[PDB]
From Swiss-Prot:
Glycans are attached at residues 31, 41, 247, 266, 313, 329, 348, 439, 488, 516, 530, 552, 604, 685, 846, 885, 926, 960, 989, 1013. S-layer large protein. May form the highly ordered outer sheath. The gene is slaA. Its main location: secreted. This is S-layer protein A. Keywords: Cell wall, Glycoprotein, S-layer, Secreted, Signal. It is found in: Secreted, Cell wall, S-layer. The chain holds residues 30 to 1069 of 1424 of the full protein. Coiled coil: none annotated. Belongs to the Sulfolobales SlaA family. Glycosylated. C-terminal glycosylation sites are modified with a heterogeneous family of glycans, with the largest having a composition Glc(1)Man(2)GlcNAc(2) plus 6-sulfoquinovose (QuiS). The mushroom-shaped unit cells of the Sulfolobales' S-layers may consist of three SlaB subunits and six SlaA subunits. One of its GO terms (cellular component) is S-layer. The lineage of its organism: Archaea, Thermoproteota, Thermoprotei, Sulfolobales, Sulfolobaceae.
Length: 1040
């Protein structure tokens, strides 16, 4: 039982799952373990308990939560069914609320109920009236008493009517049924009873939940206050970036356990877009080609080459010594035509260059001028047609001879020196639709919570409408015409004789960067001029989307034909006409994000609607969820730092990168993978994305939703793992071929996700580091993706949704010198390294510390940011941290020092020498300074003896003005400094103390004890770190 039921309390539970008798059954229970009961008085205890139960029944509007009717009821004094179980020590009763068992009783096998009341397999329950029985019967709802009235519930009452009619009620009226209960407090047997149940839901339609988030979706990052202006509206205007997951909750009362859900997303942009389109192929009748022209075949991103298509009556095309055999044939009303496909290029070749798999030509039917079509086939009726190559050195000219109907024609191609690219540019009202699926489980039915992708890696269909227009002159014997389409594509017709056809047409592909050559649409338009009662010039046209894969250009589907007609009763005349036209492109999977950015469908204006389908039960959502798209530029920042940030081991510099577009999964450390399959939706099977949580990539089979579906072994599993070397890097491990199928939150690898084409990533985003003057960089040319485990910070407890991500990534930088030249096994510690999750360490020599610098360049991870902010440069952000110069000092405590005292301290001070205690500087030779710091550690490496400076001179100027310079020798030092070592005085305050000794100085000079020695002492030290030369002086004093 979940939840458990307290001493002397009441609770209610819904009967569900496999083998459940019927819908709308609830079991009420009261805990009676607190007292003793016997066969003598069991009927008294059940009587006492069941007398005190009160039940409330409501109806509500499923979206708003508004109550629409309420009744409150009580068990009768006789004729009800209620039981006692000796084993579990509980009294229990079952009520049936919904159709058909509203007025009649239903029987519940005791095998089933044992899920909730396990005692029932051990002993049969006590009945009312003290008997024992093998089977349980419901008390029906329509038998209970209205507390308002003192009578049995009215058959006419609206709540009872509703519950009895729930089937049509829920769907049509968005009505939802809810029940709760309470036990009116009483004392029995020296114990007391009190409680109120949680409420329970009998039925509800399948909807997006609309409380409190009115839009049905939400983005945790916006609800917590982290998105600025956009946090004012998180309850009714959700936004998300390109490739990320947005959260959602569905209410589902039909489901049991886990359910696969399928989703459909429709995107729209206000107002039309201007589209740029490149000519893949050009097909004409031999009569329509111009006399002489220059041509050279273009080569597209996917390797395919443009081709030139001649249609002719002649069984070969002839060109002197060379003859061309036709790629295919077709027939119209017994007349037979041949189709020749050529690539103009390098050298005459006898084998196919590439292929085209189906191709539809449309023509006006002779009878009715309605459109009809045929697919061109090979001479053995196979569909795939081959393309051949002709050509030679530039400026070579080739004459091709053919026939159109009765008449011979000759055409003269010049082989160009540079590829012919024709661009057409038009305005079109674009829209796109996409599909996706996920497997979802719950612990709080009927609420199912999940998240869906913003843009999926499926096929996506881009679609939109446009206009074609025709202009023309008709005469007694022949007709002339031109057409415009796609704004500035132009086709022309040489004068068409009566009863003759003529063809022209073009194939385009999208003329953007990488998606070129991957997909297409083809239009071919046939014309016919004939005499009826009237002179009629008619056009008919095909419309087919096409895709290229493995060098076959193939038809995906055919949409409907279109036609236009120009009519003249007069013999000479001039005319015009128009028709709508349609356009459709199917993206190939890997290209699908790129498409949406380039055509302009994703951007700050885009708006998206979502519907959802239950794969177990065959139901669709009766309401829709909504969200809006956004693109946001990155930012870099630092908290203000002084020199203090670089002294002792626990001091570092923090940089914050703000980049929300890098956060693909709302939960930090969350991970998912993705593949493409057929998905069940509606009553159809459609190519779509399946999202799988975790870190393993699958190549599945069958259809998602049905029983065929099987994900095999993990092809690869990606993991961050520790590695050897100093510190210990954590870096990504796994087969790099599959990175375009894995998502994380780490910007050092998120750039691959849906942004890899032909096996190279489009945008070399992420974080890049250069360092100076010790030259190093990450990533180096050899370095893997995912060179460090950088992850975003979590929202804390005062926020509405804790534990969720935030757009801040916090990155720690250490620069240090004290562990330079340390060794860790085979490793020598010098340069730039990664440590832990979010840390970099740079170790530089003593002479290079001040002025060292690190420059961080962060480049956006998302292709939308690169596209919208290319010109302004707001796609990269830079920052530098660098070590500032600082003033050291050397000083005797006082200007005058007495000769009476044996030792007079000389203190040195320099911030960057400081460390944890103990630390000491030793002196030797010609005054060379050695620094030691045994307790110093940084991520496991410990400090080495450093050589940091020297005492430069010591001199005394005497009372007669003579100046003596004391020579620094290993023997002289030991007298002047009885301890050759100076200690640090306090932690991280670099201030060292030395004991220059007057008792030594006298003997070292051989000068008369005091009588001569009214003198000025002078001392000097040079440090390598800054480069400064410090000096200190004192007047030696006695009675003079
Ligand atoms: C593919 O195969 C094609 C079909 O056979 C070849 O086409 C033929 O190309 C000839 C040029 O090719 C030669 O030169 C290039 C260097 O530029 C080499 O790479 C080639 O290997 C080859 O040696 C072309 O000849 C014309 O250009 C020549 C320049 O070298 C020159 O002889 C003339 O200027 C030619 O006009 C062919 O075009 C036809 O040529 C004949 C003459 S012939 O066949 O060359 O002997 C002409 O007939 C003449 O017309 C004139 C009118 O002024 C009369 O005075 C004369 O009595 C009569 O002979 C035709 O007018 C002319 O069209 C051309 N053949 C055709 C018809 O297509 C092609 O080279 C191969 N391509 C490669 C390199 O892969
Ligand atoms: C928005 O909707 C998101 C859906 O993507 C929710 O993300 C899911 O978050 C889970 C943690 O969230 C919990 O805690 C937060 C507070 O921080 C609450 O707001 C939430 O209500 C919730 O209580 C996370 O579950 C995992 O972490 C849990 C520890 O908190 C742990 O109990 C679980 O056992 C999970 O490991 C989901 O993260 C992923 O979970 C899947 C498993 S499952 O999806 O939970 O079933 C893991 O995949 C597995 O990986 C192993 C590798 O060892 C494989 O062997 C196995 O094949 C594979 O199943 C992932 O490793 C793990 O990252 C997380 N879902 C995803 C896909 O990221 C988010 O919470 C929702 N927001 C709100 C506010 O509710
Ligand atoms: C349909 O209308 C379109 C109007 O946008 C035309 O597209 C634009 O065409 C410009 C002219 O070049 C065209 O003529 C070629 C030679 O016959 C032919 O191969 C193509 O049809 C080709 O598009 C084109 O200019 C380019 O070429 C010029 C000539 O070499 C050169 O001077 C330019 O620098 C440029 O490379 C347009 O591209 C844009 O041109 C701008 C200057 S201007 O030439 O338009 O005055 C330039 O500032 C800009 O950077 C550049 O993008 C091209 N426009 C676009 C966006 O595609 C199209 O040709 C018309 N279709 C037909 C029937 O040909
Ligand atoms: C009626 O009342 C008593 C008091 O409320 C209560 O017993 C307490 O609950 C369970 C036993 O019953 C539950 O668990 C079993 C499965 O183990 C199921 O079959 C039952 O249907 C119940 O769900 C014991 O766990 C309690 O002992 C204590 O439990 C604490 C957690 S709790 O959430 O379960 O209460 C632990 O922290 C303690 O360490 C542990 O001692 C027991 N409480 C006591 C001390 O009496 C029953 O739930 C109710 N009666 C029955 C039999 O259902
Ligand atoms: C279909 O695909 C090919 C291959 O990707 C593409 O060629 C690449 O075009 C870019 C620029 O694209 C724009 O200009 C051309 C005209 O030059 C237009 O046709 C396009 O519509 C675009 O407006 C060329 O610059 C590429 O050359 C490369 O430039 C790179 C820098 S970039 O930022 O400019 O891209 C360098 O890093 C490369 O070293 C250099 O090769 C060119 N790429 C290649 C590999 O040749 C076609 O233009 C596309 N054509 C169609 C039908 O649009
Ligand atoms: C910090 O960096 C300084 C400045 O670059 C460097 O000083 C250089 O000292 C070396 C000798 O140091 C070696 O011995 C001591 C033992 O006392 C060790 O602690 C060190 O680890 C070294 O093994 C001197 O050779 C340099 O003096 C000059 O060298 C020039 C050539 S160079 O290529 O060596 O620089 C000559 O042309 C000059 O005539 C000579 O004066 C000295 N470098 C300079 C330019 O002053 C320290 O060793 C580094 N200190 C530590 C320990 O990190
Ligand atoms: C799509 O719309 C976004 C929302 O306006 C644009 O994002 C804004 O980008 C600009 C810089 O170009 C910047 O002003 C915003 O940064 C925030 O500014 C806020 C001030 S206010 O605008 O709310 O008054 C600050 O409160 C906040 O700390 C800054 O982070 C930025 N807005 C957001 C959401 O961060 C985006 O530029 C635009 N994209 C396109 C296609 O141009
Ligand atoms: C372009 O020409 C193709 C042949 O050059 C045509 O292919 C023929 O199509 C017919 C009808 O679809 C098909 O039955 C032929 O297959 C042959 O059938 C022969 C008997 S009969 O049909 O001639 O009576 C048999 O000998 C044998 O089964 C097949 O060889 C097929 N002909 C060949 C030679 O393959 C094609 O229809 C035409 N394309 C269009 C669209 O006009
Ligand atoms: C587009 O043309 C392709 C020719 O390369 C062809 O793809 C190959 O198909 C084979 C098996 O198909 C046989 O039949 C075709 C007839 O077009 C032959 O050309 C081919 O050699 C085979 O005998 C298969 O091994 C593989 O998918 C492709 N071969 C290669 C080079 O790997 C396609 O059949 C055709 N259209 C489509 C996609 O149906
Ligand atoms: C940190 O500031 C110091 C104090 O101003 C400064 O040392 C003093 O200035 C000069 C040194 O200038 C020479 O040295 C530099 C660095 O090698 C060279 O660019 C060039 O040869 C300069 O002429 C020195 O003579 C003077 O004694 C120093 N003053 C004191 C107080 O003793 C440092 O130069 C400075 N460090 C850096 C790298 O910025
Ligand atoms: C019903 O009868 C049983 C006895 O058969 C009761 O148990 C006794 O209760 C008294 C006080 O209530 C206790 O002092 C005894 O220890 C119990 N005797 C036995 C035989 O166990 C039980 O409590 C009775 N229930 C009610 C509600 O009266
Ligand atoms: C989302 O786009 C889909 C296009 O796939 C649309 O659903 C189609 O609805 C039309 C009638 O409007 C029917 O001809 C088709 O049966 C539907 N298509 C499919 C494949 O099921 C619809 O226009 C858009 N739906 C929304 C949410 O507005
Ligand atoms: C196109 O030219 C071809 C040349 O092959 C002509 O084909 C003729 O076809 C008819 C059958 O209708 C036969 O009687 C002749 O034997 C063929 N003539 C020749 C010379 O081969 C045909 O005349 C022309 N087609 C059109 C549409 O005018
Ligand atoms: C100190 O200077 C003397 C004299 O120039 C020289 O002999 C000696 O090698 C120097 N010692 C060191 C190690 O600094």
């Amino acid at each position: 039982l979940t939840p458990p039921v307290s001493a002397g309390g009441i609770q209610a539970y819904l009967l569900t799952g496999s083998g459940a008798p019927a819908s709308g059954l609830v079991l009420f229970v009261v805990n009676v373990s607190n007292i003793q009961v016997s066969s003598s008085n069991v009927t008294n205890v059940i009587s006492t308990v069941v007398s005190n139960i009160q039940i409330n029944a409501k109806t509500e509007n499923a979206q708003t939560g508004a109550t629409t009717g309420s009744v409150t009821v009580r068990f009768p004094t006789s004729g009800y069914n209620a039981y006692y179980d000796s084993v579990d020590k509980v009294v229990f009763v079952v009520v049936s609320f919904l159709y058909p068992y509203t007025t009649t009783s239903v029987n519940i096998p005791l095998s089933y109920l044992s899920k909730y009341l396990p005692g029932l397999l051990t002993a049969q329950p006590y009945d009312e009236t003290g008997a024992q029985v093998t089977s349980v019967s419901s008390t029906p709802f329509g038998s209970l008493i209205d507390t308002s009235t003192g009578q049995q519930i009215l058959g006419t009452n609206p709540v009872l009517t509703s519950y009895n009619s729930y089937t049509t009620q829920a769907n049509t009226n968005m009505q939802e049924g809810v029940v709760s209960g309470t036990l009116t407090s009483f004392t029995l047997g020296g114990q007391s009873f009190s409680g109120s149940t949680v409420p329970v839901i009998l039925y509800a339609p399948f909807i997006f939940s609309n409380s409190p988030y009115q839009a049905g979706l939400y983005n945790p990052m916006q609800v917590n206050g982290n998105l600025g202006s956009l946090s004012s509206e998180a309850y009714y205007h959700p936004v998300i970036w390109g490739r990320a997951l947005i959260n959602t909750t569905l209410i589902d009362t039909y489901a049991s356990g886990s359910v696969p859900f399928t989703f459909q997303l429709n995107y729209s942009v206000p107002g039309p877009l201007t589209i740029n389109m490149a000519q893949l192929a050009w097909i004409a009748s031999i009569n329509n080609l111009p006399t002489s022209f220059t041509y050279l075949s273009y080569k597209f991103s996917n390797g395919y080459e443009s081709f030139l298509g001649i249609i002719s009556n002649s069984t070969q095309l002839t060109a002197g010594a060379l003859t061309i055999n036709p790629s295919g044939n077709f027939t119209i009303n017994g007349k037979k035509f041949y189709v020749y496909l050529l690539v103009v290029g390098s050298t005459n070749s006898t084998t196919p260059v590439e292929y085209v798999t189906k191709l539809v030509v449309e023509y006006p039917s002779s009878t009715n001028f309605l459109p009809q079509g045929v697919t061109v086939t090979t001479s053995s009726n196979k569909y795939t047609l081959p393309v051949y190559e002709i050509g030679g050195p530039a400026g070579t000219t080739i004459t091709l001879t053919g026939n159109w109907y009765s008449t011979p024609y000759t055409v003269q191609i010049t082989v160009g020196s540079t590829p012919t690219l024709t661009n057409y540019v038009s305005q079109i009202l674009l829209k796109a639709v996409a599909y996706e699926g996920i497997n979802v489980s719950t612990t709080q039915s009927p609420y199912y919570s999940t998240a869906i992708l913003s843009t999926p890696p499926s096929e996506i269909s881009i679609t939109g409408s446009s206009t074609i227009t025709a202009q023309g002159k008709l005469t007694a014997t022949s007709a002339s015409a031109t057409v415009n389409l796609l704004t500035n594509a132009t086709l022309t017709y040489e004068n068409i004789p009566l009863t003759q056809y003529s063809f022209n047409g073009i194939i385009v592909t999208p003329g953007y960067a990488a998606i070129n050559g991957t997909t297409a649409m083809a239009y071919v338009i046939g014309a016919l001029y004939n005499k009826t009662s009237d002179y009629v010039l008619s056009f008919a046209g095909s419309q087919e989307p096409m895709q290229v894969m493995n060098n076959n250009l193939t038809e995906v589907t055919t949409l409907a034909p279109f036609g236009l007609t120009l009519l003249a009763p007069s013999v000479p005349a001039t005319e015009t006409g128009t028709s709508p036209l349609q356009l459709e492109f199917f993206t190939v999977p890997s290209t699908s994000y790129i498409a949406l950015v380039d055509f302009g469908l994703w951007g700050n204006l885009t708006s998206v609607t979502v519907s959802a389908y239950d794969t177990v039960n065959n139901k669709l959502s009766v309401n829709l969820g909504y969200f809006y798209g956004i693109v946001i530029p990155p930012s870099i920042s630092t908290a203000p730092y002084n020199y203090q940030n670089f002294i002792c081991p626990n001091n570092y510099v923090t940089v914050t990168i703000y980049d929300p577009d890098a956060v693909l999964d709302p939960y930090p450390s969350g991970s998912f993978t993705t593949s493409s399959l057929p998905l069940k939706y509606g009553n159809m099977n459609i190519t779509g994305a399946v999202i799988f949580p975790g870190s393993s990539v699958y190549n599945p089979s069958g259809v998602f939703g049905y029983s065929n579906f099987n994900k095999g072994a993990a092809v690869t599993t990606f993991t961050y793992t520790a590695q050897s070397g100093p510190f210990s890097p954590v870096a990504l491990t796994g087969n790099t071929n599959y990175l375009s199928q894995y998502a994380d939150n780490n910007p050092t690898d998120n750039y691959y996700f849906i942004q890899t084409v032909n096996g190279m990533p489009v945008l070399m985003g992420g974080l890049s580091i250069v360092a100076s003057p010790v030259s190093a960089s990450l990533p180096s040319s050899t370095s893997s993706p995912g060179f460090m485990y950088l992850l975003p910070s979590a929202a804390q407890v005062p926020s509405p949704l804790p534990g969720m991500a935030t757009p801040n990534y916090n990155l720690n930088i250490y620069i240090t010198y004290k562990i330079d030249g340390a060794t860790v096994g085979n490793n020598m510690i010098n340069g730039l390294y990664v440590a832990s999750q979010n840390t970099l360490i740079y170790v530089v020599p003593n002479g290079s510390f001040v002025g060292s610098n690190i420059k961080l360049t962060y480049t956006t991870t998302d292709y939308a940011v690169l596209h919208y902010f290319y010109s302004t440069g707001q796609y990269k952000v830079f920052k530098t941290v660098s070590v500032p110069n600082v003033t050291a000092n050397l000083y005797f405590p006082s200007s005058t020092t007495p000769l009476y005292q044996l030792s007079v301290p000389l203190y040195l001070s320099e911030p960057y020498y400081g460390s944890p205690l103990p630390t000491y500087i030793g002196l030797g030779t010609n005054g060379t300074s050695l620094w030691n710091s045994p307790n110093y550690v940084l991520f496991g490496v410990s400090a080495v003896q450093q050589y940091l400076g020297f005492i430069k001179s010591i001199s005394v100027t005497l009372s007669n003005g003579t100046t003596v310079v004391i020579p620094l020798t290993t023997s002289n030092m030991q007298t002047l400094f009885p301890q050759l070592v100076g200690q640090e005085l306090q932690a991280c305050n670099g201030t060292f103390q030395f004991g220059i000794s007057i008792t030594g100085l006298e003997k070292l000079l051989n000068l008369n004890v005091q009588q001569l020695n009214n003198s000025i002492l002078s001392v000097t030290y040079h440090d390598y770190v800054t480069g400064e030369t410090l000096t200190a002086t004192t007047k030696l004093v006695a009675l003079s």
